[PDB]
Write a protein that binds this DNA or RNA. Structure first.
Ligand SMILES: [Ca+2]
Ligand SMILES: [Mg+2]
Ligand SMILES: [Mg+2]
Length: 429
DNA sequence: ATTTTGACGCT
DNA sequence: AGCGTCAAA
C-alpha cells in the first residue's frame, strides 16, 4: 500500500532511428527516398547481405539477414545501397558519423545514454520538472502531441490516425494538470519534450525516428517499438497489466535469448504478466539473485537501471569474417588482414583522440577457428601504447601466433574464420 | 556463407 | 584475465 514503490519516480525515453542505415543512404541519394530499398554489405556472395530495410521494402517481406538475391525474388524493384569498402572490408564510418549527428542533438535536451549506433536513452525527469514549472497549471493540448500514441487507449464505450487521436483525447481529457507530482502528468510532459526532440532531429538531420516514453528504460524500449515508424508511444504505469497480459516474454529487453527461454520452460508460462504469480524468492531460486529480483520488479513495470551519462562508445573495434573456403590458412594471410584491421583501427583511434580527449590503453585480439559455433574462439590482450597500425598488427600476431597448431611455419591451422581487434580501457588525454 | 559491430555479466 | 550473453544496423 503506502510503502509499495511503484517505479514512477523517473521519466525515461528511448529514441530509436527508423531503418537507420537506409535513411542515411536516402538522405545522400534522393533517388532512394520513398522507395523499397535496403542497405547491403558485399555483393559477390548472393548479391550481398542485407543489414537494413526501408518500410516500403518490408511490405514485400524483405528482412535483415536476407541475401539481396533472395530479397529481389520478393521485391524485384528493390533498390540497394552498398556499405563502403575500405582496406578489403566493410567500413561503417558513414553511419557512425550520422549517429554522432543525432546524439549531439539529443544531448542538448538532456543526459543521454548511447545504447546503440542509432538509439539512446534520455533521462527527462529534471527537464519535465522544469517544463511543469514553466507551464504554470496550463492544460496540455493535443496539438503538442501530434505523433504520440497512448498505449491501451482508446478504450470502452476505423482509421489509424483516428484511433491515435481518440486515445490521446481520452488520455488528455482524464489528466490532472494541477498536480505537479502526478506520474501520468510527468510522462505526458515527457512526451511533449520528446516530440520537440524528434522534431529537432528531423529538422537538423533529415532523419525520422520513433520513441518510447515511460518510467524506466525497459518500458521505454518496449514502448518505442509499439508504433514504428515515425511515431512515439507513452506507456504509463497503469497500462502495464493489460500490456503485459499478452506480451511474449521474449519481447522484453534482455529476455530475447537463453534466459527468456528458460523462464518460459521452467515456469511453464508465455507472457510477461504471468510472472506476477511467483514470489521474489521463487524467481531468484530459478534465475539467480540478480535476475530474480529484476524479473519480480519488471513484471510489475518497475526497473531501476539508471540512464548512464555516456554519449561515446566505450570501445572501438574492427572485425572481419572469413567464411567457408575463404578461411585464412597461411601466416601471410593472417598478417595481411591483421594489418588491414589495424590500419582502420588506427584511423578511427586517431580521430577519437582528437575529438574526445582520450586514448585507448588496451588492445583486445579475438579469433575464431573453423569448426567453432562460438563467435570468439580465443581472446588475448596486450598493451596499446602507440596509435600505430604496424605495431598493433605485430602485437596482435604476437599474442595469437601460438594458436597455430601447424608444424609448418608458413601454414596456419586450423584455419581462421574471424579476426577482431578492439581498443579498450580509455584514459583522459 | 549474414557480417560488423557494442555493453555488460560471470568466475 | 578470458569467456559468455544479449543486443544493434
Ligand atoms: Ca532503429
Ligand atoms: Mg536501434
Ligand atoms: Mg532493427
Amino acid at each position: 500500500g503506502p510503502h509499495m514503490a511503484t517505479g514512477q519516480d523517473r521519466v525515461v525515453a528511448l529514441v530509436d532511428m527508423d531503418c537507420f542505415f537506409v535513411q542515411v543512404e536516402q538522405r545522400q541519394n534522393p533517388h532512394l527516398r520513398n522507395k523499397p530499398c535496403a542497405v547491403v554489405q558485399y555483393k559477390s556472395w548472393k548479391g550481398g547481405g542485407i543489414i537494413a530495410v526501408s518500410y516500403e521494402a518490408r511490405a514485400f517481406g524483405v528482412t535483415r539477414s536476407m541475401w539481396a538475391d533472395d530479397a529481389k525474388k520478393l521485391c524485384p524493384d528493390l533498390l540497394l545501397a552498398q556499405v563502403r569498402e575500405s582496406r578489403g572490408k566493410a567500413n561503417l564510418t558513414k553511419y557512425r558519423e550520422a549517429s554522432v549527428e543525432v546524439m549531439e542533438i539529443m544531448s542538448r535536451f538532456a543526459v543521454i545514454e548511447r545504447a546503440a549506433i542509432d538509439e539512446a536513452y534520455v533521462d527527462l525527469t529534471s527537464a519535465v520538472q522544469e517544463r511543469l514549472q514553466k507551464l504554470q497549471g496550463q492544460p496540455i493540448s493535443a496539438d503538442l502531441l501530434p505523433s504520440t500514441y497512448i498505449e491501451g487507449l482508446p478504450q470502452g464505450p476505423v482509421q489509424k490516425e483516428g484511433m491515435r487521436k481518440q486515445g490521446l483525447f481520452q488520455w488528455l481529457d482524464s489528466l490532472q494538470i494541477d498536480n505537479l507530482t502526478s506520474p501520468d502528468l510527468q510522462l505526458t510532459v515527457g512526451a511533449v519534450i520528446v516530440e520537440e526532440m524528434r522534431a529537432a532531429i528531423e529538422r537538423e538531420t533529415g532523419f525520422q525516428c520513433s520513441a518510447g516514453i515511460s518510467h524506466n528504460k525497459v518500458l521505454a524500449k518496449l514502448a518505442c517499438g509499439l508504433n514504428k515508424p515515425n511515431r512515439q508511444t507513452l506507456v504509463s504505469h497503469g497500462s502495464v497489466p493489460q500490456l503485459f497480459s499478452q506480451m511474449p516474454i521474449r519481447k522484453i529487453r534482455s529476455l530475447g535469448g537463453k534466459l527468456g527461454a528458460s523462464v518460459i520452460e521452467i515456469l511453464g508460462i508465455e507472457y510477461m504478466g504471468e510472472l506476477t504469480q511467483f514470489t521474489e524468492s521463487q524467481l531468484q531460486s530459478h534465475f539467480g539473485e540478480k535476475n530474480g529480483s529484476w524479473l519480480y520488479a519488471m513484471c510489475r513495470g518497475i526497473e531501476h537501471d539508471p540512464v548512464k551519462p555516456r554519449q561515446l562508445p566505450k570501445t572501438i573495434g574492427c572485425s572481419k569474417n572469413f567464411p567457408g573456403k575463404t578461411a585464412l590458412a597461411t601466416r601471410e594471410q593472417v598478417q595481411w588482414w591483421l594489418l588491414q584491421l589495424a590500419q582502420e583501427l588506427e584511423e578511427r583511434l586517431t580521430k577519437d583522440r582528437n575529438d574526445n580527449d582520450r586514448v585507448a590503453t588496451q588492445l583486445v585480439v579475438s579469433i575464431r577457428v573453423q569448426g567453432d559455433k562460438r563467435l570468439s574462439s580465443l581472446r588475448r590482450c596486450c598493451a596499446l601504447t602507440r596509435y600505430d597500425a604496424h605495431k598493433m598488427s605485430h602485437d596482435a600476431f604476437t599474442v595469437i601466433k601460438n594458436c597455430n597448431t601447424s608444424g609448418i611455419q608458413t601454414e596456419w591451422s586450423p584455419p581462421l574464420t574471424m579476426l577482431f581487434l578492439c581498443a579498450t580501457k580509455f584514459s583522459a588525454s
